[PDB]
Design a protein around this ligand. Structure first.
Ligand SMILES: [Cl-]
Ligand SMILES: [Cl-]
Ligand SMILES: [Cl-]
Ligand SMILES: [Cl-]
Ligand SMILES: [Cl-]
Ligand SMILES: [Cl-]
Ligand SMILES: [Cl-]
Ligand SMILES: [Cl-]
Ligand SMILES: [Cl-]
Ligand SMILES: [Cl-]
Lengths: 64, 64, 64, 64, 64, 64, 64, 64, 64, 64
């Protein structure tokens, strides 16, 4: 069964993850369906184990 | 059964995770469905074990 | 059954997690469905074990 | 049954977790569905064991 | 069963992940269906194990 | 009249001064005419003010 | 009159000064006429003010 | 009158000054007439002010 | 009157000064008339102010 | 009156100064009349101010 070995060496790391910036705007969205993982070493793992599973990411919905 | 081995060495790390910045704006969103994990070493693991599971991330909804 | 081994060495770490900043704005949201984990070493683990489970993250909803 | 081994060595760590900052704004939200964990070593673990479980994080709702 | 071995050595890394920037705009979206993983070493793994699974990423929907 | 301004800032310093090491040897010498100054900040100042002054450093002398 | 301004900033320094090492040898010398100054910041100043001054450094002398 | 301004910034420095190493040898010399200054920042200044001054560095002398 | 301004910035420096190494040899010399200055920043200044001054560096002398 | 301005920027420097190496040899010399200055930034200045000054560097002398 699967192995997610991650091995990392660095002397320096500078990391900027997600920046959302707005001036004088309307209706700005940064929808993320999964995790937001930010690191010198960064690992995201997701397992969905079943039938009929739904993953549904939407920025915005406007009905009338 | 699966192994998420993460091994990390660094001398320095500088990490900025999620920044959401607004001036004079309306309706600004940073919806995240999973975790927000921020680190020199950063790991997010999610397991969903079942049938018919729903993951549904939406920034915003406007009905009438 | 799964192993989440995380091994970390660092001499220095500077970490900034989630910043939400607003001036003169309206309706600003940073909805996070999971945990917010911020660390020199940062680990988030979530297990959902069942059928029909729902994960539903939404920034905002406006009905009439 | 699963093992969340976390091993950490650091000489220095500086960590800033969640900042929510507002000036002259209205309706600013930092909804977090899980824990907020902030540490030089930071670990969040959540287990939900059952069928039909709901996780539902929403910034704000406005009906009429 | 599959192995996702990642091995990394670097002396320096500077990483900027996702930037969404808006001025005087309306209706700006950066919908991401999976994780957002940002790192000097960055790994995202997703496994969906079942029949009839849906992955559905949409920027925005407007009905009337 | 002269100014020996020394200004130093360091976060870490490791300093090894004078090592003299011998195994199974004969007649090993580390003659130093001035001071031996060893420090994270190290300053040696010597002033000789007169006529006919002698400075004479010799490791060893063997007459018959 | 003269100014010996020394201004130093460092984050790390590792310094090894004078090593004299011998195995199974004879008659090994490290004669130094002035100071031995070893430091992350290291300054040696010598002033000789007079006529007919002698500086005479010799490793070894053997007459008969 | 003269100015010996030295200004230094470094993040890291590793410095090895004078090594004299001998195995199974005879009559090995490292005569130095002035100072031995070893540093991340290293300054040696010598002033001799007079007539007829002698500086005389010799490794070794053998008369009969 | 003269100015010896030295201005230095470096991120890393590795410096090895004077190495004298001998195996199974005889009569090995590293005579240096002035200072030995070893540094990430290294400055040697010598002023001799007078008439008839002698600087005389000799490795070795053998009379009969 | 003269100005010896030295201005240096480097990201990395590796410097090896003077190496004298001998195996099974006799009478090996590295006579240096002035200073030995070794650095990422290295400056040697010598001023001799007078009439009839002698600078005399000799490896070795053998009379009978
Ligand atoms: Cl960021
Ligand atoms: Cl941030
Ligand atoms: Cl923050
Ligand atoms: Cl904070
Ligand atoms: Cl970014
Ligand atoms: Cl020592
Ligand atoms: Cl040493
Ligand atoms: Cl050394
Ligand atoms: Cl050396
Ligand atoms: Cl060398």
């Amino acid at each position: 069964e699967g192995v997610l070995y991650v091995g990392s060496k660095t002397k320096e790391g500078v990391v900027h993850g997600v920046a959302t910036v707005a001036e004088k705007t309307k209706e700005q969205v940064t929808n993320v369906g999964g995790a937001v993982v930010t690191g010198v070493t960064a690992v995201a793992q997701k397992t969905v184990e079943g039938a009929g599973s739904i993953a549904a990411a939407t920025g915005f919905v406007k009905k009338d």
